[PDB]
Amino acid sequence: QSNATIELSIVIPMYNEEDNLEHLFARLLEVLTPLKITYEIICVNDGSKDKTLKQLIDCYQSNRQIKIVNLSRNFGKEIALSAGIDYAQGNAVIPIDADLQDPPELIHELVDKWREGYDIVYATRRSRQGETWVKQFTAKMFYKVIGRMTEIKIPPNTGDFRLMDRKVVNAIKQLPERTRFMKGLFAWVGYRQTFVLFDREPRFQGQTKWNYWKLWNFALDGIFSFSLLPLKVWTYLGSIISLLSLAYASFLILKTITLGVDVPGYASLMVAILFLGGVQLISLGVIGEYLGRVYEEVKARPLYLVSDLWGLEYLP
Amino acid sequence: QSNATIELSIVIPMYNEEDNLEHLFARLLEVLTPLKITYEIICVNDGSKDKTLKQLIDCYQSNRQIKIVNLSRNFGKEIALSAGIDYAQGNAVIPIDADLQDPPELIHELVDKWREGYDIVYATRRSRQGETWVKQFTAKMFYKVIGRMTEIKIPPNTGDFRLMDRKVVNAIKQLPERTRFMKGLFAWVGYRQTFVLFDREPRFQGQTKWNYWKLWNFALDGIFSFSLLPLKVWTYLGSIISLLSLAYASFLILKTITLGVDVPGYASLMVAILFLGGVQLISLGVIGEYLGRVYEEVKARPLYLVSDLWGLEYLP
Amino acid sequence: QSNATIELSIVIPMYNEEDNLEHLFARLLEVLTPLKITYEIICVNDGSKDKTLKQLIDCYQSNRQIKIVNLSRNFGKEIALSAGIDYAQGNAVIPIDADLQDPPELIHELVDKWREGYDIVYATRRSRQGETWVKQFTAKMFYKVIGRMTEIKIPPNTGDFRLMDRKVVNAIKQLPERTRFMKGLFAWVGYRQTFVLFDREPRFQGQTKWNYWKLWNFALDGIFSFSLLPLKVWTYLGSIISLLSLAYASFLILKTITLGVDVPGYASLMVAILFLGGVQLISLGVIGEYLGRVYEEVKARPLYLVSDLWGLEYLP
Amino acid sequence: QSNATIELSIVIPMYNEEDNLEHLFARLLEVLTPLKITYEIICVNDGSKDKTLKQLIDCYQSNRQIKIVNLSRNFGKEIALSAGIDYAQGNAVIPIDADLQDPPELIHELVDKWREGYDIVYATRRSRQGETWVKQFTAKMFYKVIGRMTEIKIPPNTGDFRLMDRKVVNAIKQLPERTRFMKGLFAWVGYRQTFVLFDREPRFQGQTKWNYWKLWNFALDGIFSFSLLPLKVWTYLGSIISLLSLAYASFLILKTITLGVDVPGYASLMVAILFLGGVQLISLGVIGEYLGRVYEEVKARPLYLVSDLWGLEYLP
Ligand SMILES: O=c1ccn([C@@H]2O[C@H](COP(=O)(O)OP(=O)(O)O[C@H]3O[C@H](CO)[C@@H](O)[C@H](O)[C@H]3O)[C@@H](O)[C@H]2O)c(=O)[nH]1
Ligand SMILES: O=c1ccn([C@@H]2O[C@H](COP(=O)(O)OP(=O)(O)O[C@H]3O[C@H](CO)[C@@H](O)[C@H](O)[C@H]3O)[C@@H](O)[C@H]2O)c(=O)[nH]1
Ligand SMILES: O=c1ccn([C@@H]2O[C@H](COP(=O)(O)OP(=O)(O)O[C@H]3O[C@H](CO)[C@@H](O)[C@H](O)[C@H]3O)[C@@H](O)[C@H]2O)c(=O)[nH]1
Ligand SMILES: O=c1ccn([C@@H]2O[C@H](COP(=O)(O)OP(=O)(O)O[C@H]3O[C@H](CO)[C@@H](O)[C@H](O)[C@H]3O)[C@@H](O)[C@H]2O)c(=O)[nH]1
Ligand SMILES: [Mg+2]
Ligand SMILES: [Mg+2]
Ligand SMILES: [Mg+2]
Ligand SMILES: [Mg+2]
């Protein structure tokens, strides 16, 4: 009997991952055989510049569970993951890395948490460990900032290693977004979510020169995709500055009448500067409010997500 | 004979509404039985953190008229109402609250007004009563402001308790909008609209610490979704300021030629400040006009709504 | 034999047009009978506040050529025309006014020009005549301005009285736009276009107190929907102002070194003011360029329009 | 046996190309007959103002390989090319010019490079030659700038003469964009790309008065469609200016306390000017970041492009 129903999809983005395919596939097979479930392995070639696709085709010829999504260009790991998840058909989908920095054995644990009713199972590191103090402090500050500014609650130490139920995968597919912060998006599609702790081996504990410009832009993407306060604060700042300018002008007139001293030219210049700056900041704040509305409209997120229905059929 | 056609949908958003389901359903059944019409009760669980969904499933098992829309997350009362209306199939749809602050008996009156040809029947409180003076004054000022700025006429004292005909429900479904002001949207879909007065009981007359930041943001949403004047005023303000700067410069030159006194440096600085501020305000106004056009485009409201046709079929 | 193919659609937007329906329909029938072609009359009730819809239904009961599009609200004459054209099915579509200020007899002439191969036949007044000098001068200046700024060539003295071939009607339907300047849109869908001159009778020559705020907003819509120069000029203005500030600073330093006089504080303030204003104007210009790109994207106009094909089928 | 499968499409945009059709078609037939492949010639009349369409119809009557796309208006060469490619159905598509400035014989070479597995084959001039020094320097500077700012790598000396595989054509059709920089778009859809060198004949080496305003706007389109840095730089500039203002104020206070001299009015004015300018530049930078996100959303580019699949079917 052929099930024809994939229970588990393993999505691996690959970029120059030759001389890693054999070990990765051996470990994955060793982990996935005891699970006794139908599975597929979607390997997404993200424009590799070496003999990765050739070895992938060699493995695909012999192993029926291997499928290849060959992207035209190198789009990056996140976009390769998105493509692999788009082409995945399992009831659960697990993104994993080809270098096996995240132990594939934990897949089993994830599957267990998936069978207890959880729709998202994050694989979270117990501690950051090998990451430098600067990286840890910046990550902690970013998470605190995004928690304060936004209404989403991104769990700590969560990477791309996770299990997503088919329902969560379809919810993520319902989000047409070109500027995606995946951590915030997974927090936003709030289903039954849990986490499984795992200690990453010292082989991959810390070895990375982080490009802090890329990290800064990633944090900016996360903040801007889920908060509009940076656009709203300016109208109130302009109102405060204009009020200060008006109060200063009133005080200058009061000193002119009660002391008989004409207002100095620099004081009038300061009043005009503050008033014009506040008016322009109010205009910028109104523009920012309307631009936030436009951004919300063009992100085109669903108003809601239905997780379960009783007595009703799902709307197309 | 099975009608298979729901005449009335009752949409109830629920968030932690356990220990209220029994009384709510008993009152609703007592009201809806004499109506002698087929009905459904769409209960929308908006991510309740207690045993609300369990009791909802218990009620759904026994009562065939109860259906449950279980949202993945807590999206808020308005979004839960939107989801329930999306899943409703009655000829008329009535959003009601689970705490029964709005008397369900008035449903009957609403249905009567629905059978007289009205497409929207608002349930309006006779007086605000228990609301504090600050709340009443802010609401009155907001309604006056939105009436002056916009072309819509939002009726006073209207809440979410209302009856919408299927035609109005479909018109609202035709509005893809992520930043929705529902009061203004219902005013904008102008069908045959009336209201039914009702005095809310002292049990729910006034007990609420209003978060005026949330109210302010709600008013901002309402003003910005139906008015573009806050974007347009800035170009005229900049034109006025630039004209004043040019007139001041002309007066300074006139005093330089007729009195033989060279222009003081502070006067020239003031002229430059005013001219640059006016030019930047004109630029901000042009940007605001184009941003208002962009906002109108991305709101993607239908150009018109057809209420009735004679000799023609409805366009798909 | 029943043709079942409407050759001509007459679209009439109506708002409080009772006591005009009898004369309008009599004149239209007198004009359209000699044409010996199948026709329909789409009357669009734009939320009339009198017994217009009742008389329209009375006429529709007896006359098989009358169809009624009843809009939910009063959306305005232009939107009512858009709805009527959307519901029209004739090979040619002619928008006409219910008061018959434009002679329906000219319809015949329009039809003639339609049979000579022209896709758009404008009905143009020979002279403005009754319009005041202010109105004529403002219209002439607006048309000159829109001709200079844009690449479209809006013909003079063209109103809503025109004939549009089905191909032009479908091209206009291909333009999803919520901020529409119909004159510019018809110029933009450039098919075989001609005009027929007609002298409007003194009964409707001039009687109108034009709301120049509405006319100004209409002109702004026309300019902004087909020109982006108001967004682009600001970056060049800022560049010029910044260059002037830098040159002034250089001249001040040159006078400081060649004359031994330290730069006065007001001169340094002026340099800073001009430099900051120019930098902010460059920023506003870059924002305006990107906003113009966004506006072009969200207007979603077709890249091209195909008028004829040889050896190919039309793309869906 | 009728193949019914076009192997090669030749897309020719034509604008006033009468007295060139005979030579163009003779040369094209001479080149395309030895290829021994099925082909079509899509001639796109871009609103020609002479007897171009008549001769095109005459040629289409006799030659079964000629098809005509008659655009309603003159939309420009690039849009005419887009329409012709949209109506092309060959496995490979080659845009060529009607004046035959690019030798059609090179088509053969392109086809050869297409059969070696390349999806895009650019026809690149060996040297610019006849172009003036100003044109060459501006082109080189523009290409260096777009290479530095963006992540795309536009090949040098590439024109519209190229071969695109059906897969690349479909990828380009997947890009709904009204503001298109085709060079950057072809760089962005990164498939197997190569180039074929060709020396353009002295008949077309250099004869052109380039409109540098149009070239400047084209370069602006290219930079803005693939870079957001012009929107991002302003927040950092504002931060720097605000920091300088704060440092200047601190230095002034330090001199006030350590020297006992009250701060001059011009110094305080300068501090206020710099602080307000920096705050407004930060606001403009935040607006620019959000506007860049909006532009990315409304460009609606696909997240990825799949070039090949193994074990999976293409997603609809
Ligand atoms: O453009 C691409 C496309 C796919 N992949 C795949 O992504 C998987 C793992 O990516 P990897 O580069 O090994 O990242 P990590 O090991 O998880 O750690 C990263 O941590 C930083 C951000 O997490 C990155 O900037 C660093 O490159 C890297 O050390 C592998 O299968 C790769 O093939 C890439 O890395 N880059
Ligand atoms: O996130 C949610 C989702 C659903 N519901 C449902 O909405 C119904 C009624 O909502 P409720 O909180 O009782 O509001 P009201 O009784 O109508 O009065 C409100 O008046 C203010 C705005 O109307 C609110 O901010 C206050 O929370 C509240 O006092 C109930 O079925 C709730 O279960 C919520 O209230 N919050
Ligand atoms: O909201 C609506 C909906 C439909 N119509 C119909 O439009 C037709 C003609 O409109 P009308 O008001 O008579 O305009 P005109 O006679 O063409 O002249 C106008 O010229 C100005 C702009 O053209 C308008 O602002 C003035 O109201 C009016 O004098 C009639 O069938 C009306 O019923 C309106 O006028 N207003
Ligand atoms: O609006 C249109 C529509 C179609 N075509 C067709 O495009 C082909 C070639 O265009 P052409 O005008 O001859 O450009 P080039 O010979 O490639 O060189 C150009 O180089 C510059 C930009 O490449 C242009 O601005 C100059 O007009 C021109 O010298 C011909 O089949 C034309 O019919 C146009 O040129 N303009
Ligand atoms: Mg790794
Ligand atoms: Mg309540
Ligand atoms: Mg009239
Ligand atoms: Mg040429």
3-class state of residue B203 by DSSP: helix
* C298 close contact with B: CB closer than 8 A: yes
Q: In what order do the strands lie in the sheet with B158-165?
A: A306-310, B66-71, B39-45, B8-14, B92-95, B158-165, B120-125, B193-198
Tell me if B79 and A304 make a contact (CB, 8 A cut-off): yes
Could you tell me the CA-to-CA distances from D305 to A299, B260, C132, D121, D192 in Å, in that order? 21, 74, 60, 19, 13
Distance (Å, whole) CA D71 – CA D90: 21
Give C35's contacts (C-beta < 8 A, 6+ positions apart).
C8, C107, C108, C111
Q: What is the DSSP letter of C203?
A: G
At B4, give phi and psi (nearest 5°). 60, 10
Q: Which residues pair with D198 in a beta bridge?
A: D125
Q: Reported resolution in A? A: 2.5
Method used to determine the 3D structure? cryo-EM
Nearest CA to ligand 4 atom 27: D208
For A55, the token pair is 């070895």
Question: Contact at 8 Å (CB) between B38 and B5?
Answer: yes
Q: Which ligand 1 atom is nearest residue A214's CA? A: 25
Nearest Cα of chain B lies from the Cα of A111 at a distance, in angstroms, of: 21
* D310 close contact with A: CB closer than 8 A: yes
Taking the centre of ligand 3 as the mean of its atom positions, its distance from the CA of residue C203, in whole angstroms, is 15
Distance (Å, whole) CA C55 – CA C72: 18
H runs (alpha helix) in D150-208: 166-173, 182-188
Single-letter code of the amino acid located at D296: E
Query: How far, rounded to the nearest angstrom, does the alpha carbon of residue B160 sit from its chain's CA centroid?
Result: 9
* DSSP assignment string, D26-76: HHHHHHHTTTTS-EEEEEEE---SSTHHHHHHHHHHH-TTEEEEEESS---
Count of CA atoms in the C-beta half-sphere (13 A) of C152: 22
C205 CB within 6 A, ligand 3: no
Question: Contact at 8 Å (CB) between C32 and C59?
Answer: no
**Beta strands per DSSP E along chain D:** 8-14, 39-45, 66-71, 92-95, 120-125, 158-165, 193-198, 306-310
Give B17's contacts (C-beta < 8 A, 6+ positions apart).
B24, B48, B52, B98, B99
Q: At what angle do helices B265-299 and C212-226 cross, to 10 degrees?
A: 80
Count CB pairs under 8 A between chains A and B.
133
Q: What is the DSSP letter of B314?
A: P
Question: Contact at 8 Å (CB) between D37 and D6?
Answer: no
Nearest Cα of chain B lies from the Cα of A8 at a distance, in angstroms, of: 22
H runs (alpha helix) in chain B: 21-32, 52-62, 77-87, 106-115, 133-149, 166-173, 182-188, 212-226, 229-259, 265-299
Question: Contact at 8 Å (CB) between C169 and C91?
Answer: no
Taking the centre of ligand 1 as the mean of its atom positions, its distance from the CA of residue A14, in whole angstroms, is 9
Calculate the dihedral angle through the C-alpha atoms of A195, A198, A203, A209, rounding to the nearest 10 degrees.
40
At C208, give phi and psi (nearest 5°). -165, 125
3-class state of residue B71 by DSSP: strand
For C165, the token pair is 């071939």
Interface with B, mutate which of C178, C221, C274, C295 (most B CBs under 10 A): C178
For D64, the token pair is 């079964």
Residue closest to A242 by CA, chosen among A285, A271, A202, A208: A271
Distance (Å, whole) CA D238 – CA D224: 21
Interface with B, mutate which of C21, C52, C60, C69 (most B CBs under 10 A): C69
* DSSP assignment string, chain A: ------SEEEEEEESS-TTSHHHHHHHHHHHHTTTTS-EEEEEEE---SSTHHHHHHHHHHH-TTEEEEEESS---HHHHHHHHHHH--SSEEEE--TT--S-TTHHHHHHHHHHTT-SEEEEEES--TTS-HHHHHHHHHHHHHHHHHSS--PPTTEEEEEEEEHHHHHHHHT---SS--HHHHHHHS--SEEEEEE---GGGSS-----HHHHHHHHHHHHHHH--HHHHHHHHHHHHHHHHHHHHHHHHHHHHHHH--PPPHHHHHHHHHHHHHHHHHHHHHHHHHHHHHHHHHHHT--S--EEEEES-PPP-
C104 CB within 6 A, ligand 3: no
Question: Contact at 8 Å (CB) between B67 and B39?
Answer: no
* D70 close contact with C: CB closer than 8 A: yes
Nearest Cα of chain D lies from the Cα of A293 at a distance, in angstroms, of: 10
Single-letter code of the amino acid located at A106: L
Distance (Å, whole) CA B65 – CA B87: 14
Question: Contact at 8 Å (CB) between D311 and A89?
Answer: no
Could you tell me the CA-to-CA distances from A115 to A92, A119, A195 in Å, in that order? 10, 9, 13
Give C4's contacts (C-beta < 8 A, 6+ positions apart).
none
Nearest to B292 among A290, A303, A315 (CB): A290
* A306 close contact with B: CB closer than 8 A: yes
Distance (Å, whole) CA D206 – CA D101: 11
At C313, give phi and psi (nearest 5°). -95, 150
Backbone conformation region of residue C260, classed left if phi is above 0, alpha if psi is from -120 to 50, else beta = left
Question: Contact at 8 Å (CB) between C7 and C107?
Answer: no
* B4 close contact with C: CB closer than 8 A: no
At D310, give phi and psi (nearest 5°). -130, 115
Give A231's contacts (C-beta < 8 A, 6+ positions apart).
A285, A288, A289, A291, A292, D286, D287, D290
Distance (Å, whole) CA B270 – CA D215: 39
Pick the CATH number of C8-226 from 1.10.150.530, 1.10.10.10, 3.90.550.10, 3.40.50.300: 3.90.550.10
Query: With 0-12 CB in 10 A as exposed, 13-18 as middle and 19+ as buried, what is A178?
Result: middle
DSSP count for chain D of H helices, then E strands = 10, 8
Residue carrying the six token digits 């270098």: A99
A101 CB within 6 A, ligand 1: yes
Single-letter code of the amino acid located at A242: S
Give C18's contacts (C-beta < 8 A, 6+ positions apart).
C48, C50, C51, C52, C55
- HEC string of A58-114? HHHHHCCCEEEEEECCCCCHHHHHHHHHHHCCCCEEEECCCCCCCCCCHHHHHHHHH
Distance (Å, whole) CA C150 – CA C228: 9
- How open is the CA angle C263-C266-C271, to the nearest 5 degrees? 80
Strands C8-14, B193-198: parallel, antiparallel or unpaired by DSSP? unpaired
Q: How long a stretch of residues is chain C?
A: 316
Nearest to A291 among D291, D301, D303 (CB): D291
At C93, give phi and psi (nearest 5°). -125, 130
At the topology level, CATH places domain A8-137+152-208 in Spore Coat Polysaccharide Biosynthesis Protein SpsA; Chain A (3.90.550)
Residues in chain D within 8 Å Cβ distance of C279:
237, 277, 281
Max Cα–Cα distance, chain C, nearest Å: 102
Nearest to B270 among A269, A307, A310 (CB): A269
Max Cα–Cα distance, chain A, nearest Å: 102
Strands D158-165, C120-125: parallel, antiparallel or unpaired by DSSP? unpaired
Strands A8-14, A92-95: parallel, antiparallel or unpaired by DSSP? parallel
Distance (Å, whole) CA D80 – CA A167: 44
Distance (Å, whole) CA A301 – CA B78: 16
Distance (Å, whole) CA D83 – CA D85: 5
